[PDB]
């Protein structure tokens, strides 16, 4: 349930012991998770 | 000189309701108060027969089931105008002048032919509204076949394994038996699937001896009706089994009148018991639960004879025709011509993992080594 | 809703109403006004 | 042709069409039980498809109706009131043209001397303490059938020609000669004119003063008539452009026009009213098909 | 001309009794047509499914008013009204009818706590409120005030000022306008209406300025003086920083006037309110009233 | 990567069977009425009909028989979302002007606050394509991983939500377990050890839910005339109503043939009046779509055109080619 | 009475009488309100010889009394004076697709390049005014008022650069244009009152409204909103910012001011808005004849 | 042969989708059934 | 051009104007939209 | 107009003459061969 | 409105008997021939 938008990394943070859902944009293409963009895929885009 | 030749006019053919073979599906009975009827309903009483259980098995109890079927209702209308000048020339002559005589006779023929055209239009609207209701009712063939295959035990309504396999069977029946006349050519196979339709469809309630009866008392059983583009191919592939025979068919509508009993109960209790006088006089006697004829459904009407294109499907004589002769020149479409909407999906840019990558069909194609050829970026496919 | 009318009043028999065994129909709610009872229910006899 | 015969045929056709609208054929089984009075009433059996004018009964305290219980045919005004006991109250056009500003002082005092009592004084005080005029008092229709009991019964016509019953002595709208004016290049252009009522306000340094005008013009189109009335009222319009900002009273326009209905050009005649000896000049419109349109304001 | 309506679902006895309570009412109808189903009867096929309030106000102007006459066994007889003739209207709205009042149709104050006169399988029946014209103007102005001030923040009296807007009174019948704190049940949101008003009040002064700064040599004599007064009273310090310091295009002026005139003839809906009915008499206990039909 | 979805409309002749005397019709004597106007006198003849359906089981069936034509292009004109949700914008004027510039929308400044009924209520196109050769086309859009397995997903009839959403495997009248089927990933999907293949379509609040579900489409304004062929998969208020028992599901389905969807005017619109006779949508009923014969390049497409093998799917190294599931080209060539 | 008989003064031809048989059910306005008329008062040609000014033709066409053609017989020509709220069938002339449900007005003829194939007979023509939807009638009246406001700005070739961009408009896939506006002073009065009302909207505009622009720019954000931000950025020729933003229960004054602003807007709309003459109910499939239930 | 299949349906006018699919059908009928006696030999086909 | 795609253009019955110019897809009696079909490239052609 | 059986060189044209496959269009690296849409040679051989 | 014979189209003329080469196509008897016997020896070709 963490992945909701492929541009936006989502998480839970604690401020004053409230669970605080948190959206934060993945800016660069590599900051997408490696099961969602494997390293051979980055090498293939690099060879492009 | 400019010579103008003879004026040729059209003759519109006349559509009796009981000439078209939709009237074997129909059973039409005049009743002059459905403008005030709220809900017509028929009430059916089914008691189920059970099997005797073996030793030390809990016997299922005697099961009594009632189902009530309601009435939909649907109006039709026809409007036609008369112009003010035609209405002036209709009724009187101002003087005995020749042009007044000619336009008087023309306006009289205009009014008479317009009334004839409106009566024909009400008959064809009855055809179209009943065909509308049949297509609103009728579920498709793959659903009907899958529901005939899947039945239930007493214990619980359609277990999850049953309905999941039912869904997968719906997938399979849809993807095989979709485009029916076009894929195969086997008269054996196509006759088999029409046999599957006629065994899948359940039978009606009323068994009249004379409603659509052939010679020597064999009743015709249903109608198969399509458009003419289907039925030309169907005759060309099933000409062995198609005949034409004379069937004793009704010609007039049934007719029902209230009594003072029914009108009084309609005033007092907002309701009508049909078959009320038989329902009254069979009360104190022994024959309570038996009653023979339903006056609202079985009523004496005039009979005639006519020809029908029939088929023989395992000792089943079925009328078989197209309604194009009543949708020859009509603003509404033949409603058997219907549209599908199939949804398609396809990818682009899916990176197959190089780490577990392979290729079959190596001998067929061979790429030129470029990373635009080694990564999919676009997707190619054919149009219509 | 009137079911003792069915339970008491005259009825016309009819041949081959059904094919797919109304156990399935009633179990999967095909109908609009249905009513089932297993043992002989006495509430047809309480005529008021 | 014969001519005389066809004329009689057309007259018989019109009389029979009047009977077809008036009576109704009965398809009851019509048995011989009833008495002869019910017999002849079941043969005739009237219905009200004959008058085709729309009236309204109205109750008003009779202190307010000083010339209008005698002179049939007047504009009437509905004044809603915060008193629960009488929620609406009815008002003569002359009763409101008293404190209209268009009327000269001689005619104003003369009419007031008709309209001097305690009830009318209190109602004029209420009308003056009201902020604007046009949506606390409003146009209501044309007078017929004054009864003058204790609380006088007034019929009043919303639509159609003005008559009580019998379709005899069809009364006419009576407009005070001073308050009306016809803005057009050719007065009485070709044929039947439309009669309007124009409410125009004015501000003499302290308060608002209303003015009640009646216009007669050949134009049907309301945009055309407000376009001719702006050209007529452009100066005082300018004075209100200065007033309506510094004021805080809840109004947003200079005036409003509303159609009374049709008239006829040859059915315009002068005259004078008299109540208690006060001769008062009027322009008596004779036959009026009353047709109230909506109020259309202009700023 | 009459209209038959046959319902789509079945009706309860309480529903048929509701219709017999509502046997005279106005119903708007999209298609001027003889046979109409309950799938298109009423106004709920338009409101709640499509842009609301201003297109709703245009649509309530442009639909066909049609009154209930008689309820059959299960069908509805709706007679559509002819101009210049009498009809009879029952009183559904809260405000009391009086004689000689003009009547109009306002959209319903669509709180979703209403009793929902019919609710027949995801379809419901919504009628417009027949109301006097003065109250209709007042309701329109209060709604535009609510829709304007609901966008402002940091008023610490915002609750009491919305409450003083929502409470209106007319002939001793109070009602609260249900567009409270933007509950969004049906706020109607009126966002083009307030946007259009403020486009008018913002594009007005500079358009009248660019027109009036030209051709004063001709003796108009009234317009030039009036605009100077009207503009420099309210906007007393007129055009100091100027934005662009008088570099305008004739095409830009063209686009300014064309836009500011589009806004007016498209807010034409909230411009006027037509008198659908002029009630001549009102029956006792204010149940129903016989009126005449206009527009 | 992206699953592109597209619907196509087919002209189909389609026959009916019905048992004899299956349903009775009761009628009134046709009533005459006359409206006498000043230019015409119009006579209206009205007639009331009622239908009682006497058979208990389905006494009338209907099978798809033969294709006439395909009114769809099967083109590629994708859904212009800048005309589908034409109210939205990026913040800066330079950014928004450059995005409209590069994606090539016409009329980049809407003048909505001036004239909003033009474009909130639905941008009227005002101009069809001047040339048109194959009928209607419209292609919707789902954004996705470059990771999602082809052979699990793309080569078979399957829901493009990623997680399958067919209510013929859910407890009827159990909306809690229904929403757990549409959303839960503590549980698994069937058919794989993978409860998801599109974690931006299947997941709640993902770019399936925030973009195509009408529960959020009615919040974020849009053209109602714009036809989106993925609302039929992602509207969940119109699948929790399908969470009923099976005969109610198919009665609701065969009653859903009012066919508001036209097949006129150069592109798929969705008008909603129900004038057309009939449509039948088995993809709507089965809640999945179909795979069609696409490929990754012309190299694989040429050998497909040689052997005709549009049924068997085959893959190169990173170039894939999907097999078609209904050989409708062969169907058209057979008639 | 209601019926009017038109009798042509000049003789005609069989092609002419065939055109009049084609031309049936067309609204023709007459100025006379008599029972007999000649060809001198049929149609609109007895006014379109006087300066051919479109505003002038529109004004007198408002003053006209409209009738409907009925039953061309001999050289006589029946005209029904249509009653209020009744239903009549109208054959259409305006080049439009005529979607039902809308209101119609009656507009002067927009001069196309091809001459009328209707009736030209002995220095007399049959000038039939068009019937158009009310929205495009208001659009034309906007364009005329706009050319008045801009042709006050006296220029050379800028009038042309405005007019050639402006005049050709497209409504329901139909291009129309109206030439040769000599820009008389009659439009200047109809424009002076728009100028008055814009001055008063400015002076009586409340404090909520100009604030509402900036407040909604800070709260919401949209491209459509930006278009309005682009207008307010493109012209900043007022710049007079107010002092207070407290709104400390001035609410009756606010109601009074908003009522005034709406009423001035209604006045400008009453300028630009033309009277609905017809209400369409039923349209033929040809879009050639259609029924209405309303006659001025 | 193409006109009898693509007869105008009872609507307002002949539609663009109708005539475009009619044009594609013209292409297909022309490229299939052009040289008639010479390609096939099925007496059933030629009789058809 | 030496760039024009074979498989989109040359392998099919196709107009050698490049842009296809068949009047069976154009609005009849509409010369303006006709010349837009023969000349315009703000619009796209079909088939690509 | 119609496409006819052309090719880029004799290499492609000889294999076309071998298999008779004048309908299917096939490509080499930069050499191409266009498939014929009416097999008029086979038409003339059939009569 | 009724009219029986059209003299410009129907007129009494003498009849005879002759042979034709016929085909049967679904109860349709069709004459079937070539005009080469009248284009045997001319200055024109057979226009088919």
């Amino acid at each position: 349930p963490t992945e909701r938008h492929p541009f936006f990394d989502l998480t839970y943070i604690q401020k004053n012991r409230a669970t605080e859902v948190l959206c934060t944009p993945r800016i660069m293409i590599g900051n997408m998770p490696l099961p969602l963009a494997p390293i051979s895929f980055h090498e293939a885009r690099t060879n492009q | 000189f400019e010579a103008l030749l003879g004026i040729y006019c059209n003759k519109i053919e006349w559509i009796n309701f009981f000439t078209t073979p939709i009237a074997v599906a129909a059973n039409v009975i005049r009743f002059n108060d459905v403008s005030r009827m709220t809900l017509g309903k028929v009430l059916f009483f089914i008691q189920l027969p059970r099997v005797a259980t073996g030793n030390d098995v809990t016997a299922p109890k005697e099961t009594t089931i009632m189902v009530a079927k309601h009435s939909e209702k649907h109006p039709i209308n026809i409007s036609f105008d008369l112009s003010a000048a035609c209405l002036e020339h209709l009724e009187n002559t101002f003087k005995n002048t020749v042009i007044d005589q000619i336009l008087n006779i023309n306006a009289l023929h205009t009014v008479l032919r317009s009334l004839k055209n409106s009566a024909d239009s009400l008959e064809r609207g009855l055809i179209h509204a009943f065909m509308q209701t049949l297509l609103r009712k009728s579920p498709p063939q793959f659903i009907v076949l899958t529901m005939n295959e899947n039945k239930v035990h007493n214990k619980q309504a359609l277990s999850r394994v049953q309905r999941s396999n039912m869904f997968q069977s719906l997938k399979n029946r849809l993807l095989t038996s979709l485009f029916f006349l076009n894929r195969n050519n086997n008269s054996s196979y196509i006759y088999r699937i029409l046999n599957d339709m006629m065994e899948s469809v359940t039978e009606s309630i009323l068994n009249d001896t004379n409603n659509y009866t052939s010679k020597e008392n064999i009743p015709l059983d249903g109608v198969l009706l399509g458009p003419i583009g289907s039925i030309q191919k169907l005759t060309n592939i099933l000409s062995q089994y198609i005949s034409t025979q004379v069937v004793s068919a009704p010609i007039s509508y049934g007719h029902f009148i209230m009594g003072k009993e029914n009108a009084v109960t309609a005033i007092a209790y907002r309701a009508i018991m049909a078959d009320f006088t038989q329902f009254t006089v069979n009360a104190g006697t022994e024959q309570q639960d038996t009653n023979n004829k339903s006056e609202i459904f079985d009523k004496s009407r005039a009979y005639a004879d006519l020809k029908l294109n029939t088929l023989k499907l395992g000792d089943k004589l079925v009328a078989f025709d197209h309604l194009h002769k009543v949708y020859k020149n009509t603003d509404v479409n033949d409603p058997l011509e219907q549209s599908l909407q199939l949804t398609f999906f396809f990818p682009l840019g899916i990176y197959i993992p190089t780490e577990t990558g392979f290729s079959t069909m190596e001998t067929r194609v061979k790429l030129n080594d470029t990373m635009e050829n080694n990564l999919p970026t676009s997707v190619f496919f054919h149009n219509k | 809703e009137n079911w003792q009318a069915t339970e008491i009043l005259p009825k016309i028999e009819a041949p081959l109403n059904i094919f797919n065994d109304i156990k399935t129909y009633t179990a999967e709610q095909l109908f609009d006004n249905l009513r089932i009872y297993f043992g002989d229910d006495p509430s047809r006899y309480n005529i008021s | 042709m014969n001519s005389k015969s066809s004329a009689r045929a057309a007259i018989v056709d019109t009389v029979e069409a009047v009977k077809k609208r008036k009576y109704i054929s009965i398809e009851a089984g019509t048995l011989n039980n009833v008495v002869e009075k019910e017999r002849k009433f079941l043969k005739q059996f009237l219905s009200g498809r004959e008058n085709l004018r729309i009236a309204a009964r109205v109750f008003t305290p009779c202190e307010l109706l000083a010339p209008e219980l005698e002179n049939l045919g007047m504009l009437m005004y509905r004044f809603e009131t915060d008193v629960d006991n009488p929620k609406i109250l009815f008002v003569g056009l002359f009763f409101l043209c008293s404190n209209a500003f268009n009327v000269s002082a001689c005619v104003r005092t003369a009419l007031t001397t008709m309209y001097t009592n305690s009830m009318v004084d209190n109602v004029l005080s209420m009308i003056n303490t009201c902020k604007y005029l046009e949506d606390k008092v409003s146009l209501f229709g044309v007078t017929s059938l004054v009864s003058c009991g204790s609380s006088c019964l007034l019929s009043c016509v919303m639509q159609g020609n003005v008559y009580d019953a019998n379709k005899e002595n069809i009364h006419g709208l009576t407009v005070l000669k001073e308050i009306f004016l016809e803005p057009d290049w050719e007065p009485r252009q070709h044929s039947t004119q439309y009669v309007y009522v124009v409410h125009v306000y004015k501000e003499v340094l302290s308060k608002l003063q209303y003015g009640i005008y009646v216009v007669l013009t050949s134009f049907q189109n309301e945009d055309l008539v407000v376009d001719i009335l702006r050209q007529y009222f452009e100066k005082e319009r300018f004075l209100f452009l200065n007033y309506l900002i510094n004021s805080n009273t809840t109004l947003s326009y200079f005036g409003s026009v509303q159609r009374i209905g049709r008239c006829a050009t040859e059915d315009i005649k002068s005259g004078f009213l008299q109540y208690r000896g006060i001769t008062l000049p009027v322009i008596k419109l004779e036959n009026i098909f009353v047709d109230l349109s909506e109020k259309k304001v202009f700023v | 001309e009459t209209v038959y309506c046959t319902f789509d679902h079945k009706l309860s006895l309480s529903d048929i009794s509701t219709l017999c309570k509502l046997m005279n009412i106005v119903i708007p109808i999209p298609a001027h047509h003889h046979l109409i189903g309950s799938g298109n009867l009423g106004l709920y096929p338009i409101v709640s499914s499509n842009k609301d309030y201003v297109h709703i106000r245009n649509v309530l102007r442009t639909m066909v008013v049609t009154i209930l006459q008689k309820v059959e066994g299960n069908q509805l007889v709706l007679r559509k009204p002819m101009t210049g003739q009498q009809y009879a209207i029952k009183n559904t709205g809260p405000f009391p009818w009086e004689k000689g009042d003009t009547l109009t149709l306002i959209p319903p104050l669509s709180t979703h706590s209403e009793e929902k006169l019919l609710k027949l399988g995801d379809w419901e029946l919504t009628v417009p409120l027949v109301v006097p014209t003065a109250i209709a103007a007042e309701i329109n102005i209060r709604l535009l005030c609510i829709g304007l001030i609901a966008v402002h923040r940091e008023y610490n009296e915002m609750q009491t000022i919305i409450d003083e807007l929502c409470s209106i009174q007319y002939r001793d019948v109070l009602i609260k306008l249900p567009d409270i704190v933007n509950d969004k049940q049906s706020m109607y949101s009126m966002k083009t209406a307030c946007i259009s008003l403020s486009m008018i009040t913002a594009m007005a002064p500079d358009i009248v300025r660019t027109y009036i700064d030209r051709l004063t040599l001709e003796d108009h004599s009234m317009l030039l003086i009036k605009c100077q007064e009207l503009l420099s009273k309210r906007t007393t310090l007129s055009t100091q920083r100027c934005g662009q310091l008088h570099a305008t295009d004739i095409k830009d002026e063209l686009k300014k006037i064309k836009s500011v005139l589009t806004m007016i003839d498209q807010i034409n809906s909230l411009t006027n309110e037509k008198t659908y009915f002029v009630v001549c008499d009102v029956s006792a206990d204010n149940r129903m009233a016989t009126c005449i039909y206009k527009n | 990567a992206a699953t592109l979805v597209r619907t196509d409309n087919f002209d189909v002749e389609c026959l009916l069977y019905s048992s004899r005397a299956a349903t009775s019709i009761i009628l009134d004597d046709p009533t005459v009425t006359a409206e006498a106007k000043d230019i015409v006198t119009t006579y209206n003849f009205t007639q009331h009909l009622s239908f009682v359906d006497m058979g208990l089981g389905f006494s009338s069936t209907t099978a798809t028989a033969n294709l006439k034509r395909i009114k769809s292009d099967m083109g590629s004109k994708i859904q212009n979302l800048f005309s589908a949700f034409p109210i939205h914008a990026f913040t800066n004027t330079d950014i928004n002007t450059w995005i409209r510039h590069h994606v090539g929308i016409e009329k980049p400044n809407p003048s909505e606050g001036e004239a909003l009924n033009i474009i909130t209520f639905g941008g009227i196109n005002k101009n069809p394509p001047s040339i048109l050769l194959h009928g209607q086309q419209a292609i919707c859009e789902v954004i996705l991983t470059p990771v999602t397995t082809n052979i699990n997903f793309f080569k078979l009839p399957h829901n493009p939500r990623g997680r399958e959403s067919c209510m013929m495997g859910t407890d009827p009248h159990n909306e809690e377990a229904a929403r757990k089927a549409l959303y839960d990933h503590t549980q698994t999907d069937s058919d794989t050890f993978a409860a998801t293949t599109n974690p931006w379509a299947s997941l709640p609040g993902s770019l399936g839910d925030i973009l195509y579900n009408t529960a959020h489409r009615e919040q974020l304004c849009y053209n109602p005339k714009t036809y989106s062929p993925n609302a039929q998969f992602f509207t969940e208020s119109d699948i929790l109503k399908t969470n009923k028992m099976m005969y109610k599901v198919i009665n609701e389905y065969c009653m859903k043939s009012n066919s508001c969807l036209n097949s006129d005017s150069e592109i798929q619109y969705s008008c909603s009046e129900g004038t057309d006779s009939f449509v039948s949508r088995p993809c709507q009923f089965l809640q999945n779509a179909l795979p069609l014969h696409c490929s990754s390049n012309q190299a694989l497409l040429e050998s497909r055109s040689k052997t005709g093998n549009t049924q068997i799917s085959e893959t190169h190294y990173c170039n894939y080619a999907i097999g078609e599931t209904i050989p409708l080209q062969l169907i058209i060539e057979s008639s």
Side-chain angles (χ1 to χ4, degrees), chain D residues 53-58 78 80 84 87-88 139-140 158-159 234 238 241 245-246 291-294, chain E residues 84-86 96 98-101 170-172 222 225-226 230 233 273-275 278-280 292 294:
Chain D
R53 62 104 174 84
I54 296 164
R57 292 179 183 175
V58 149
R78 185 193 72 248
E80 66 178 357
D84 295 329
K87 292 183 180 179
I88 62 176
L139 182 64
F140 185 74
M158 291 292 177
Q159 186 179 4
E234 55 184 1
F238 181 90
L241 300 192
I245 303 167
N246 198 1
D291 192 1
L292 298 178
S293 71
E294 65 177 0
Chain E
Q85 295 180 359
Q86 295 179 355
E98 285 291 326
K99 299 174 76 172
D101 295 335
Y170 192 90
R171 285 182 292 194
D172 297 331
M222 181 187 173
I225 287 57
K226 207 289 295 299
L230 269 276
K233 197 269 288 293
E273 54 272 10
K274 59 182 66 173
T275 68
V278 181
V279 50
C280 66
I292 69 173
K294 289 182 178 179

Side-chain angles (χ1 to χ4, degrees), chain E residues 1 34 75 192 262-263 266, chain F residues 35 44 48 113-114 116-117:
Chain E
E1 188 181 4
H34 196 274
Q75 307 188 356
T192 306
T262 305
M263 303 309 169
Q266 286 278 317
Chain F
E35 296 180 356
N44 190 3
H48 297 90
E114 187 262 321
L116 41 84
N117 291 320

Side-chain angles (χ1 to χ4, degrees), chain F residues 72-127:
Chain F
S72 176
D73 188 359
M74 293 180 182
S76 288
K77 182 172 71 174
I78 52 95
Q79 187 175 1
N80 194 1
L81 266 71
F82 291 98
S83 68
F85 290 162
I87 193 67
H88 296 287
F90 296 102
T91 294
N92 289 315
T93 306
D94 294 330
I95 299 171
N96 198 3
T97 303
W98 184 70
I99 293 300
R100 303 299 188 94
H101 181 275
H102 181 74
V103 307
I105 178 176
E106 299 294 319
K107 296 179 181 180
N109 41 358
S111 295
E112 175 68 12
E114 187 262 321
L116 41 84
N117 291 320
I118 291 172
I119 282 170
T120 29
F121 177 67
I124 56 171
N125 301 114
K126 295 179 183 178
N127 294 114

Side-chain angles (χ1 to χ4, degrees), chain F residues 58-284:
Chain F
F58 294 103
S59 62
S60 299
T61 191
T62 291
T64 295
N66 206 171
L67 284 175
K68 295 291 186 185
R69 289 180 292 112
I70 296 178
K71 296 183 80 177
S72 176
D73 188 359
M74 293 180 182
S76 288
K77 182 172 71 174
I78 52 95
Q79 187 175 1
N80 194 1
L81 266 71
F82 291 98
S83 68
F85 290 162
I87 193 67
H88 296 287
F90 296 102
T91 294
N92 289 315
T93 306
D94 294 330
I95 299 171
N96 198 3
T97 303
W98 184 70
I99 293 300
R100 303 299 188 94
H101 181 275
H102 181 74
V103 307
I105 178 176
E106 299 294 319
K107 296 179 181 180
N109 41 358
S111 295
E112 175 68 12
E114 187 262 321
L116 41 84
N117 291 320
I118 291 172
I119 282 170
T120 29
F121 177 67
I124 56 171
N125 301 114
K126 295 179 183 178
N127 294 114
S130 56
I131 190 166
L132 180 63
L133 294 170
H134 300 282
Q136 288 180 352
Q137 70 275 18
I139 286 91
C140 187
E141 179 65 41
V142 178
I143 293 169
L144 181 58
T145 73
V147 179
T148 302
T149 302
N150 298 111
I151 306 180
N152 288 319
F153 187 75
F154 289 106
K155 296 178 182 292
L156 293 165
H158 195 278
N159 192 2
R161 192 172 62 87
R163 184 178 178 86
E164 189 165 355
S165 68
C166 305
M167 299 306 107
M168 304 299 290
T170 307
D171 192 3
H173 297 285
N174 194 358
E175 293 179 354
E176 181 68 30
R179 291 180 182 177
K180 289 176 71 67
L182 274 81
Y183 293 125
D184 195 4
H185 301 287
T186 303
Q187 294 180 358
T188 178
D189 193 2
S190 178
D191 290 324
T192 320
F193 294 99
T196 315
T197 61
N198 310 335
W200 288 280
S202 179
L203 297 177
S206 64
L207 60 85
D209 194 3
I210 68 169
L211 179 60
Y212 293 145
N213 195 0
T214 47
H216 298 94
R217 187 181 293 269
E218 69 182 2
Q219 294 177 356
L220 295 175
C221 183
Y222 68 106
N223 305 333
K225 293 179 70 67
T226 298
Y227 181 76
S228 180
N230 207 6
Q232 66 181 358
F233 293 156
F234 291 169
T235 49
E236 298 182 356
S237 63
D238 293 332
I239 204 66
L240 297 176
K241 63 101 179 177
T242 306
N243 275 303
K244 290 179 183 177
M245 306 185 83
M246 191 270 175
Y247 291 100
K248 298 299 292 295
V249 172
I250 51 95
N251 284 316
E252 180 66 32
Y253 177 71
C254 68
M255 189 64 205
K256 184 67 176 175
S257 295
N258 196 5
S259 69
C260 295
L261 275 302
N262 56 359
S263 188
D264 196 0
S265 178
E266 62 81 20
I267 197 172
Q268 293 175 355
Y269 292 113
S270 65
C271 63
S272 64
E273 69 271 12
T275 301
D276 192 2
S277 296
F278 290 101
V279 73
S280 63
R281 292 185 296 265
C283 296
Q284 174 75 49

Side-chain angles (χ1 to χ4, degrees), chain D residues 40-119:
Chain D
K40 67 184 181 180
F41 188 77
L42 268 295
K43 295 295 182 183
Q44 295 302 112
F45 190 71
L46 282 77
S47 68
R49 304 295 182 185
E50 192 270 333
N51 290 319
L52 274 299
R53 62 104 174 84
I54 296 164
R57 292 179 183 175
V58 149
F59 291 95
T60 305
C62 64
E63 291 86 3
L64 284 80
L65 278 299
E68 305 173 357
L69 56 85
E70 186 68 27
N71 299 321
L72 290 174
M74 291 296 171
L75 283 173
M76 285 175 62
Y77 284 153
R78 185 193 72 248
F79 179 75
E80 66 178 357
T81 309
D82 294 334
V83 180
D84 295 329
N85 181 2
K87 292 183 180 179
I88 62 176
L89 182 59
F90 288 88
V91 152
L93 178 66
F94 293 153
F95 172 68
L96 206 133
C97 286
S98 66
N99 293 321
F101 76 97
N102 192 13
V103 177
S104 295
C106 294
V107 179
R108 180 183 296 164
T109 58
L111 85 70
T112 286
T113 54
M114 286 193 285
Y115 280 134
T116 175
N117 281 315
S118 294
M119 183 64 72

Side-chain angles (χ1 to χ4, degrees), chain E residues 236-264:
Chain E
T236 305
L237 270 295
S238 297
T239 314
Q240 278 66 236
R241 183 70 270 175
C242 301
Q244 202 175 3
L245 272 303
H246 292 284
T248 67
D249 194 1
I250 300 99
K251 183 256 185 64
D252 194 4
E253 195 71 33
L254 187 71
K255 197 262 185 180
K256 287 174 70 176
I257 275 92
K258 180 182 175 288
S259 64
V260 78
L261 290 176
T262 305
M263 303 309 169
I264 298 170

